[PDB]
Amino acid sequence: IGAQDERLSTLIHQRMQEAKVPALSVSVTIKGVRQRFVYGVADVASQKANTLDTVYELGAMSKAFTGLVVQILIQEGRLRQGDDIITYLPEMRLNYQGKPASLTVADFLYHTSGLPFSTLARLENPMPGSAVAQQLRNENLLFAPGAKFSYASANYDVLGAVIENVTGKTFTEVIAERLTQPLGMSATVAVKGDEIIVNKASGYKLGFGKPVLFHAPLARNHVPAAYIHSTLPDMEIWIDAWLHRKALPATLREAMSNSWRGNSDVPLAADNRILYASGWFIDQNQGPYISHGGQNPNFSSCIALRPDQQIGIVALANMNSNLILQLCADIDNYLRIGKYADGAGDAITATDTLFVYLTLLLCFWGAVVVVRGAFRVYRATAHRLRVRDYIIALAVPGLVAAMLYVAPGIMSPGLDWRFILVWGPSSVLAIPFGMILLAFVLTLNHQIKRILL
Amino acid sequence: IGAQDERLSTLIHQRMQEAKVPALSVSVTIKGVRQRFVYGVADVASQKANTLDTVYELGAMSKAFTGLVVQILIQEGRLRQGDDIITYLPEMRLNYQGKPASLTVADFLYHTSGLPFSTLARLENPMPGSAVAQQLRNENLLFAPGAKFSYASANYDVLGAVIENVTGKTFTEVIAERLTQPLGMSATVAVKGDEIIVNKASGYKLGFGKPVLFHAPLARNHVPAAYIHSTLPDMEIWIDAWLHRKALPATLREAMSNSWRGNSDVPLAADNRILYASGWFIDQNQGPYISHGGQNPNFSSCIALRPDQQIGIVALANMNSNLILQLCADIDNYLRIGKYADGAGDAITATDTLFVYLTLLLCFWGAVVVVRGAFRVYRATAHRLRVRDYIIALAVPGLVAAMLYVAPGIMSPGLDWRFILVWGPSSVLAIPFGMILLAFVLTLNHQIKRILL
Ligand SMILES: COC(=O)[C@H](C)NC(=O)[C@@H](CC(N)=O)NC(=O)CCCc1ccc(Br)cc1
Ligand SMILES: COC(=O)[C@H](C)NC(=O)[C@@H](CC(N)=O)NC(=O)CCCc1ccc(Br)cc1
Ligand SMILES: NC(=O)C[C@@H](NC(=O)CCCc1ccc(Br)cc1)C(=O)O
Ligand SMILES: NC(=O)C[C@@H](NC(=O)CCCc1ccc(Br)cc1)C(=O)O
Ligand SMILES: [Cl-]
Ligand SMILES: [Cl-]
Ligand SMILES: [Cl-]
Ligand SMILES: [Cl-]
Ligand SMILES: [Cl-]
Ligand SMILES: [Cl-]
């Protein structure tokens, strides 16, 4: 019944400019009164506008969907959170101290399973004939199940496989029949792959200071953790369902109430006593404040609810940015006290900037060697031999490239260049190449500069 | 009425061994039933035992004392938290955007003042004829007063100066008459300097893997933030007063109740909605959980209260360790759920280890140059000239030392080597020295190896 808040709009434009995301869509609910902020382009090359129809990957905001469906099957008596995972995924052996470990459904709901960080690299790589249980079989857990909170995205991929086993249905179908169809979220879907979705934003990723179109992987097994697709009107319906459950049938209502119950049975750090529930963080400080970010290789998003004040906040963007991950908290500060802190830092940006300077140094280092060599070749001389000369100068770059290829596997067991390339800036690949190229021209110069008679 | 908890004792011994602190004293209260854990040596060289009489610097757990006295003067009508600091410290000009800023008593209570981190270096350096207002005069604030939470130790030194101005008494005297004498904390004192305190632990600091005796500065102006001295029985009385206020006079009771009221008028981060009150952190998660650590150059400590369960936890140690800063949370996890996470990392240890490897590399680099040079001098030859040779080879180490001396001031304006040496491991000083020593022997070798005819 009145214009939207211009200080709110200012904040969001500012964070959009700092984030450099091509598209940003935001919706703020405050006791029915909703405000919408829909800016930028969903596709840069074709100048396709960000509209309310624009579809986004939800990232880890997918987990609230998966977790709620788990709580629906629990509420219907088809599952127990105390059930052992082997009852539903019989081939998933997971070891602690060399011995098969008992993992419960609760362990995956609450990230108390022990799966190493590298299970993200396996689940996100498309593997067309491999079930989740095979991709994770014989993984070495970091700690005894239940012993601490340790976030791992693939925990919710295990839960998607449980859903399918319990129902005998595809994950796509269960989400539709249990969530999107009952709630009326007619533009939300769990995808089956990288099939073409009309209205989906193109996804972008920072490279040399600018957003670069990035075609990210979309592995069918990883959809329950990362790849539910939605729109801003559907996410407002999502928000409104969590805030207003009267109109909802009792099984969905009960499941929701059980979905916001955080796991208190883990050690808490001195500066963080926040609990994780069924795909949400639960914070009692200036709360209840229920929240979750969504970080994909080339999408990012955030959601936060303050149900006692009837507040819901969702942001969607087609680039991975920490400024979008934090924007919901910024907007909550704004609604709460009318102020907000400066833009947080961003790992992709800092890394991208570090790599611009590093490849520039390699050019200056390389051009110093080229200009120095042409000055030698022009001022002096110029008036099976070239074989052994071309052999010693070519092994060094090929040997520098050999060590470069294995270095990720060694310094961090479980990760590979494929994973690094998916998540890091577009500029990462110029670091190895400028290195082997420099190591090429350096070895050649010294091999030839020893031929001076 | 029963033996102390052996799983608790195990935890504390383990964290003591991992921390490597020479002395550790811990007290846990649970509804009257207290347990005590008093281990190690207060002085290593003389093998002086850690006893209940052993006195410790409280670090930033001093601030709860200062803050409570502030709230006593507020409760007595001698001060308002909304009062401008210039009313009591008339010469302290503090600038925001080149212009004198209005700072309140509340700004310093709640760390919403804008004082840069480097004000710690000024307040901790003894300055015998300088008031706090002069040490801070014309400082450039990081942000508009009140605009965010930003911890700075010197904020409580400003409050100690307010106490003295309001009362016309020394800080030592006000603490005694308003806190330690009424509560019966007969071994707690705000010190005036580095005068000899009988029973005080020696303080230690990590160096080359081992604790090294360290005589830290003790500036009179910085006592309200860092240097209140207490004992474990006195800290149990402290804890018990905060938990049990009936027996207390109403002014002290009221001041205490106002001392646990956190400042909600600052932006909160997505992962941290904890408030700061009058020298305590206030956390509603699995709470109220009221806590504060104490980190000095060569002491560390922690305190945490869970008043609804009548729980108080204090730890005191005579070395700066993150394992002691986190131990209170570990013990709270233990009491709460019977488990606890692994030992957190420690910055001093990681830095000390990094420097051991760096100075070892400099020896290997240096010994490679020495052995290579004696092999040249013995195999070959050995059968105003030495002046210009000794001049070119001596400026390089003295010029490397010149750049080394200024580098802290440049990379982080406001800090100097004096500050670095106070807080970092004993091994920090071998990094510049091995560098200038290496830069000495490298320049000499090349200057002499060019004399080969
Ligand atoms: C400097 O500021 C920060 O670091 C802020 C505070 N943190 C972040 O931005 C986090 C998001 C978060 N809040 O968790 N982003 C990431 O973790 C993604 C990094 C991905 C990546 C991978 C390989 C390479 Br090579 C480069 C980058
Ligand atoms: C690796 O693990 C960590 O970093 C943990 C998580 N953090 C810490 O230990 C913090 C304590 C804290 N919890 O705030 N310790 C310090 O900040 C003191 C560092 C002092 C210092 C100064 C100069 C130089 Br040279 C070297 C050291
Ligand atoms: N796509 C998903 O599975 C969703 C998932 N996102 C993440 O885990 C962010 C990965 C961040 C990261 C990447 C590379 C490196 Br190297 C360091 C850090 C989640 O947040 O649940
Ligand atoms: N002694 C006091 O004033 C108490 C005060 N302690 C601190 O601030 C810890 C300083 C930590 C640090 C030191 C050097 C560098 Br480089 C980085 C970080 C507090 O916690 O209030
Ligand atoms: Cl079904
Ligand atoms: Cl199918
Ligand atoms: Cl309702
Ligand atoms: Cl008085
Ligand atoms: Cl005096
Ligand atoms: Cl009482």
Residue B97 backbone dihedrals phi, psi, to 5 degrees: 60, 40
Residue B110 backbone dihedrals phi, psi, to 5 degrees: -110, 15
Distance CA A61, CA A52 (A): 18
Of the bound ligands, which one is closest to the alpha carbon of residue B227? 4
CA torsion, ordered B93, B96, B97, B98, to nearest 10 deg = 10
How many Cβ atoms sit within 10 Å of the Cβ of residue B35?
A: 16
Helix, strand, coil tally for chain B in percent (to 5) = 45, 15, 35
How many Cβ atoms sit within 10 Å of the Cβ of residue B182?
A: 15
Give the containing element (helix H, strand E) for B316.
Answer: strand B311-317
Q: Is the dihedral of CA A177, A183, A185, A189 positive or negative?
A: negative
Spatial CA neighbour of B352 closest among B424, B436, B420, B434: B424
How close A361 gets to chain B, by Cα (Å)? Answer: 21
Angle of the A385-411 helix axis to the A430-448 helix axis, nearest 10: 150
B431 lines ligand 2 (CB under 6 A): no
C-alpha angle with apex B42: B41 to B48, nearest 5 degrees?
70
Spatial CA neighbour of A292 closest among A324, A270, A268: A324
- Whether the link from the prior residue into B288 is cis, omega within 30° of 0, is yes
DSSP A226: H
Distance CA B263, CA B146 (A): 10
How close B195 gets to chain A, by Cα (Å)? Answer: 34
Distance CA B131, CA B287 (A): 40
DSSP state string for B87-106: GTSTT--EEETTEE---BHH
Give the containing element (helix H, strand E) for A408.
Answer: helix A385-411
Distance CA B380, CA A78 (A): 88
Helix ranges (DSSP H) in B285-384: 322-325, 327-337, 347-379
How long, in residues, is chain A? Answer: 453
B423 lines ligand 2 (CB under 6 A): yes
| Cross-strand partners of B48 | B43
Distance CA B386, CA A41 (A): 73
Looking at chain A, after which residues does the C atom sit over 2.5 Å from the next written N, breaking the chain?
Answer: 383
What end-to-end distance do the CA atoms of chain A give, in Å? 89
Residues B185-221 as b or e (16 or more Cβ within 10 Å = b): bebbbbbeeeeeeeebbbbbbbbeeebbebebebbbb
Q: Look at the block and give the residue holding tokens 């290593």.
A: B44
**8 A C-beta contact, residue A283 and residue A274:** yes
Residue B36 backbone dihedrals phi, psi, to 5 degrees: -125, 145
Asked if B177 reaches chain A (Cβ–Cβ under 8 Å), the answer is no
List, as own/partner pairs, every contact residues B334-340 make where C-beta atoms lie below 8 angstroms and the sequence separation is at least 24, other chains included.
Answer: B334/B7, B334/B8, B334/B11, B335/B28, B335/B30, B335/B311, B336/A268, B336/B286, B337/A264, B337/A265, B337/A266, B337/A267, B338/B7, B339/A147, B339/A266, B339/A267, B340/A267, B340/B11
**8 A C-beta contact, residue B341 and residue B18:** no
| Beta carbons within 8 Å of A2's beta carbon, 6+ residues apart | none
Token couple for B123: 């307040």
Distances (CA, A) of B112 to A135, B102, B271: 50, 12, 19
Spatial CA neighbour of A318 closest among A303, A297, A346: A297
C-alpha angle with apex B117: B115 to B121, nearest 5 degrees?
110
Give the containing element (helix H, strand E) for B442.
Answer: helix B430-448
Distance CA B76, CA B142 (A): 33
Distance CA A215, CA B71 (A): 59
* Cβ under 8 Å to B: A residues 68-127: none
Helix ranges (DSSP H) in A215-346: 223-226, 232-243, 250-259, 322-325, 327-337
CB contact under 8 A, A267 and B330: yes
| Beta carbons within 8 Å of B245's beta carbon, 6+ residues apart | B252, B253, B256, B257
Query: By alpha-carbon position, which residue is closest to atom 14 of ligand 1?
Result: A322
Helix, strand or coil for residue A260?
A: coil
Distances (CA, A) of A180 to A176, A241, B31, B252: 5, 11, 50, 58
How close A1 gets to chain B, by Cα (Å)? Answer: 28
| Cross-strand partners of B283 | B289
Method: X-ray
Give the containing element (helix H, strand E) for B212.
Answer: strand B210-213
Distance CA B273, CA B34 (A): 31
Q: Among partner residues A148, A268, A326, which is closest to B329 by beta-carbon distance? A: A268
Q: Look at the block and give the residue holding tokens 């990883």.
A: A222
DSSP A52: T
How many Cβ atoms sit within 10 Å of the Cβ of residue A364?
A: 10
- Whether the link from the prior residue into A288 is cis, omega within 30° of 0, is yes
Query: By alpha-carbon position, which residue is closest to atom 25 of ligand 2?
Result: B424
DSSP A307: G
Token couple for B117: 């981190």
How close B275 gets to chain A, by Cα (Å)? Answer: 8
| Cross-strand partners of A25 | A38, A316
DSSP A206: E
Distance CA B170, CA A378 (A): 81
DSSP B311: E
C-alpha angle with apex B431: B425 to B436, nearest 5 degrees?
150
Asked if B214 reaches chain A (Cβ–Cβ under 8 Å), the answer is no
Q: Is the dihedral of CA A149, A151, A156, A158 positive or negative?
A: negative
* Cβ under 8 Å to A: B residues 299-328: 302, 304, 325-326, 328
Of the bound ligands, which one is closest to the alpha carbon of residue A307? 7
Domains of chain B: 6-337 (3.40.710.10)
Distance CA B133, CA A169 (A): 72
Q: Strand order of the sheet with strand B311-317?
A: B48-49, B33-43, B23-30, B311-317, B300-306, B289-295, B281-283, B275-276
Distance CA A395, CA B7 (A): 59
**8 A C-beta contact, residue A136 and residue A158:** yes
Spatial CA neighbour of A278 closest among A41, A451, A105, A93: A105
Chain B partners within 8 Å of A329 (Cβ): 268-270
DSSP state string for B18-65: HHT-SEEEEEEEETTEEEEEEEEEEETTTTEEP-TT-BEE-GGGGHHH
Query: By alpha-carbon position, which residue is closest to atom 24 of ligand 1?
Result: A424
Helix ranges (DSSP H) in A244-384: 250-259, 322-325, 327-337, 347-379
Distance CA A43, CA A23 (A): 8
| Cross-strand partners of A189 | A229
Strand locations in A18-101 (E): 23-30, 33-43, 48-49, 56-57, 94-96, 99-100
Spatial CA neighbour of A28 closest among A316, A260, A248, A244: A316
How far does Cα A200 stand from its chain's mean position?
A: 17
**8 A C-beta contact, residue B269 and residue B335:** no
**8 A C-beta contact, residue A351 and residue A314:** no
Q: For A290, which residue in chain B has the nearest alpha carbon?
A: B270
